Design a protein around this ligand. Structure first.
Ligand SMILES: NC(=O)c1ccc[n+]([C@@H]2O[C@H](COP(=O)([O-])OP(=O)(O)OC[C@H]3O[C@@H](n4cnc5c(N)ncnc54)[C@H](O)[C@@H]3O)[C@@H](O)[C@H]2O)c1
Ligand SMILES: NC(=O)c1ccc[n+]([C@@H]2O[C@H](COP(=O)([O-])OP(=O)(O)OC[C@H]3O[C@@H](n4cnc5c(N)ncnc54)[C@H](O)[C@@H]3O)[C@@H](O)[C@H]2O)c1
Ligand SMILES: NC(=O)c1ccc[n+]([C@@H]2O[C@H](COP(=O)([O-])OP(=O)(O)OC[C@H]3O[C@@H](n4cnc5c(N)ncnc54)[C@H](O)[C@@H]3O)[C@@H](O)[C@H]2O)c1
Ligand SMILES: NC(=O)c1ccc[n+]([C@@H]2O[C@H](COP(=O)([O-])OP(=O)(O)OC[C@H]3O[C@@H](n4cnc5c(N)ncnc54)[C@H](O)[C@@H]3O)[C@@H](O)[C@H]2O)c1
Lengths: 359, 359, 359, 359
């Protein structure tokens, strides 16, 4: 049985979620994407955006356009791999999307505008059953990180969920292995060296609520607060108040790295941490946590679908010799791709669990 | 008396226009910037924006803030070398700007949003007598380029003028010299290799009226139509229909170059054009047309206040030997800086011809 | 009978040529790459370089390494699809390369250092039979552009040959169709907006032969002369003395675009020209000249294996209305990828004509 | 008596050292720059390089050229406001530099190639008395960081010294304040987000000794080991074995940031650290350590003469609330400009102490 999905906000993630939703061969069989929504209804423009991606290259699937019925002005329907996706009109208010009529039960909320759970329940007002916010939520939405706490998904209780941030999805798996392996975490500070994003500015512009983020994005190292590490304390509750961090947004369009400096609860070694991470990645963290022992740079993690790619060499080489407690872990992530894949994993995990809890 | 100016839209152009008139030593003396305007009235944010510039460096003048009335919550007044500039609230419609009470005679229309002459006529309904549109104007606003036609300005018929584009300001002075020095232009195509701008996107984003323009700006060569070459045909009407061209937006935040290819109206040589261009730049085009014969690159034109800096070595080395008609001229421009100074130049020229009247 | 090939210089073009021939399924099937050469013979390093490409992503074939002899310390042999490629020690002088001992009959000369015919001829003395110089050659190497004049190749007479430059492989196809289709080129000036390259500098650095080219490559627009349009003259003899041009090296790591302004040798129209290039594209330039009518930016041309991808929209939109003689044509090229495919194409053609010649 | 200085390696640091000199009014008074050496003696080209700077703007001071003698073919002498500087030809071996003949007493060793003490001592064979290696040195060169341990300079003992790395110059002043004030450093790991440099490559190139550093610099985040934090342990011996760190080389041509994470040796708070860094910056660390509490991005530190500009807002905002031991300090540095000033200060200090010893 195909699950009926709707993507509200067809941007980097709204669209990579779709590409991710296709790359896995899921479109039309396991997942029917019933409707995607951006500003316009222009299937030709939507399709163009899908076809060509500056970072992720050309979309593997042929995208065509058609009309829902001849009484429509322009093609308002994408056709991906024979499957038809209607382009619905954006709404200032999620409550005004016609989800029920469409028969969409799962809304991927990827606008960046409705991270407030109250707003994101708008979709449930429009007829959906579940929303997955492609961002940290606010207002008590259950935050779920695949491979970390996603099994805490309660079908009967969790209707509007957050898939956390890309950064949390990179960090949390690392911290989860640290915790699960018994290294523990006294405290940690993470810095993400972060590719610039849609909210940033080509040239110095107005950014009233973040002055640095208003600065020319591709020519600056631009510091920023981030709630990603604090957010881990909500996904891995034993790390609450133990982690924070920041971001430096740097002139790359995609791919980021977590630089986690933490203190372990008891004596260990970076070697043990590195052996754990590598085993975790092979096993109970498989598909979520990867590692490389290669000399990779950011471009090499483009289209990596893991949420965290432990950089073994950068980690092993850049720690204190003989150190027992105070460690740095480097883990990469394609902030766009890894995350978008996780959204799909989440949606899929929720659907199997919604199936189980029904029949 | 003090030339009473107001800048509607404090951004790259609004600020650099301000930074240009300050730097030309005009603030307070020749020119009274009574008010500026953007989204917020947060003079502290304006001050930070003026203080720090990714391309143009730190502002040479100290900028403090104050309240205009002790009754106001946050500082809404800028102080620049002891000159007070009120930060007034943004309007969706220029007609609702308080230029009347404020005493603003000259408005600089640098929002990007009221380039429609009629729209920009709002400042007039708001209290102002003159408006300089810091972009190409639609709607029959008189386009003026300093050094080329700025003497065609008529105080009695021209109240809403365009300062044209930064690209036209680069190109028109070249074409003006070409025409005036007797070489003439039969036809010409121009390509501007252009630094990306505010309207562009850090990452592939929605740009429905300019699909290529929607694509990640700092990792792409992005072709674009430009009206700049056609616009010269307004500024130098003998060239109407004779010129067009395009833009390639490239990963630099400022500085552009005109690469004009044209066919002269008489047999000439590149050496003739070269010498003419150098002559004109020393004489009647002083301050507007500059030239270099050094091995310059885009960074070297940062903070150059000329409209057009003719590249002698690039032109002379890249033309057909012994050619009589078919030439490429290479001319640089700091698209933010030169233009901004020209805006100030235009206002200074408008004020002089508005006064002395009519004497 | 598999073509015995050695690649001298395994950088951007050395590797991309190798990747091009692998992509085309030629390795060990149609072409025996016996040896590759660079500053080292560390096959592990070669493998890493092949495996990860900033621009071109992950190589589609697995690379392994092994040892030519079990004693030989660090791995010196690449293995791709069962095929053993020796990493031979670089020589300051090509005649010292053991080509005759390796059975290499075709050398791709991709160092950038043996571009002079007499220098590349050293390969022949090292025992090779044919040399394709992966750049313009001096000293009277026959220049061959696939799809334009490669059929001029003369096995008995042409032993050291040039595949021209990426830029000439981009322009020649356009000029070729112009001349072949009866438009003609009276005069032509080209600008290529060029990606920065290996010869450029990350930060302002010493570049005695090219002052501009020493300037920080990723933050500057950097004018250059080019012999690319002038060189179309030896490939299309009728265009000799009629064409020249320049480059602006802009901050993208790969993909460039030809901006050609020409005067036709008869009244025509950009629609005629547009249609002619599309026809050529679909026919006798198939695989060499491509075209788009989409809103493509440079990233979209990454891994395009055509020489020239004519930009229909940018051309159609940026020409003088109703103009009959004076035209601009816009054509993209992945300077790395398209050219690399041509190198392989050329060797294959040459090998086919070498085979035919004597029997 | 101005000190006779030679600059061996007139690159980024070679040249910014020279700018520091002139800007500070030290030329011809404190310091005679007798010669600068790079790949040739072409003063014209030297002057072009000094004149135009992608990151630091146009040299404010006029540079002219003459010949040392009429026998010389081309200009070999820079003239900067009366001050004459001979361009001498690069020697593969410093021992062949004509220092003795020239009367050059102090050599700024800024090639990046004679960083081994024994190799830098070549300048001493060449007739110099003192070498400041403008990088970390190997082979036992005393490392000196201005404002931290520079008073440890011993005229009779230290003839070839290291002024450390740009990074250690950022870190050491912070760590110094932390140690001096009794906050202490139990363990520390730093990361530097680091502008690309001259050793990096524009496109994926060969870098056998640093695979990642071979990768395209301006399109990647490129991890790297660094000796910078470890090197603090030579400069502040109490921190030996207690600090290491790494680098992420990111796509900016200048300005870097240290992200220090450490455990204090006693209970503190980041407000107390913050307070102490500011107080030191105004007092005993003045000119070496600076601070900002503004919303600065890297562009804003371009041309900042300090070794370390502590980012009070990035620090204060991104630490654990109520944390007593485990902290992050964000400090910026213009890796080129700050450091080059430091080089100058070092030579001046060494000169001071040499006059006071040899009396
Ligand atoms: N991009 C990343 O690396 C990344 C990673 C993880 C999470 N996220 C989160 O994903 C969300 C979106 O991120 P993005 O990077 O894709 O940004 P984006 O701006 O590319 O995507 C948002 C899209 O929503 C569209 N939109 C705006 N208003 C809308 C409306 N009312 N209805 C429908 N569509 C509307 C926009 O036009 C845009 O195309 C944000 O919350 C962001 O924090 C982003
Ligand atoms: N930037 C350049 O290179 C350049 C050069 C020449 C001409 N221009 C023209 O100048 C105009 C602005 O260019 P820019 O680069 O400064 O763009 P910008 O976006 O940097 O500046 C525009 C500013 O207007 C403000 N604004 C938006 N709506 C407003 C409103 N309703 N009321 C008041 N303020 C408002 C925005 O906050 C922004 O800061 C455009 O028309 C552009 O074509 C730009
Ligand atoms: N890069 C492009 O876009 C492009 C396109 C068309 C043609 N070309 C031409 O191809 C040639 C190579 O350019 P590239 O971009 O690959 O530069 P590159 O520097 O990336 O590749 C050159 C390789 O040759 C190696 N090399 C140097 N000396 C050698 C020697 N003696 N023996 C063996 N190897 C040696 C270098 O280590 C390097 O890896 C140049 O002539 C260039 O003009 C380049
Ligand atoms: N760039 C920075 O931010 C920075 C900061 C602090 C220290 N350093 C150190 O400064 C030194 C120079 O760095 P840079 O960034 O200026 O590099 P650079 O490449 O810009 O400067 C090195 C200069 O030395 C010249 N040179 C090479 N061989 C020479 C020789 N045999 N004799 C004379 N000159 C020769 C090169 O042409 C080049 O101009 C390096 O050791 C580097 O680690 C660099």
């Amino acid at each position: 049985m195909p699950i009926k999905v709707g993507i509200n906000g067809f941007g980097r993630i709204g669209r990579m979620v779709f590409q991710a939703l296709c790359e896995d061969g899921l479109l039309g069989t396991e997942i029917d994407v019933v409707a995607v929504v951006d500003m316009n209804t222009d299937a030709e423009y939507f399709a163009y955006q899908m076809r060509y991606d500056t970072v992720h290259g050309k979309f593997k699937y042929e995208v065509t356009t058609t009309k829902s019925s001849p009484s429509v002005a322009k093609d308002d329907t994408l056709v991906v791999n024979g499957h038809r996706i209607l382009c619905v009109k954006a709404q200032r208010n999620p409550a005004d999307l016609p989800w029920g009529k469409l028969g969409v039960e799962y809304v991927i909320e990827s606008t960046g505008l409705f991270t407030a759970k109250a707003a994101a329940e708008g979709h449930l007002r429009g007829g959906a059953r579940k929303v997955v916010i492609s961002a940290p939520a606010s207002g008590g939405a259950k935050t779920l990180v695949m491979g970390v706490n996603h099994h805490e998904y309660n079908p009967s209780e969790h209707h509007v969920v957050s898939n956390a941030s890309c950064t949390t999805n990179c960090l949390a798996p690392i911290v989860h292995v640290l915790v699960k392996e018994g290294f523990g975490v006294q405290t940690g500070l993470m810095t993400t060296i972060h590719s610039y994003t849609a909210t940033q500015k080509t040239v110095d512009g107005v950014s009233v609520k973040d002055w640095r983020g208003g600065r020319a994005a591709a020519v600056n190292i631009i510091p920023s607060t981030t709630g990603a590490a604090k957010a881990v304390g909500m996904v891995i509750p034993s790390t609450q108040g133990k982690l924070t961090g920041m971001s430096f947004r740097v002139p790359t369009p995609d791919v980021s790295v977590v630089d986690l400096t933490f203190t372990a609860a008891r004596d260990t070694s970076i070697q043990e941490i590195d052996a754990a991470l590598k085993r975790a990645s092979k096993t109970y963290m498989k598909g979520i946590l990867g590692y490389t022992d290669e000399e990779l740079v950011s471009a090499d993690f483009i289209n990596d679908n893991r949420s965290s790619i432990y950089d073994s060499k950068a980690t092993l080489q850049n720690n204190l010799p003989k150190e027992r407690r105070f460690f740095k872990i480097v883990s990469w992530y394609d902030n766009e791709w890894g995350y978008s894949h996780r959204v799909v994993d989440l949606v899929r995990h929720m659907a199997s669990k919604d199936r189980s809890a029904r029949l």
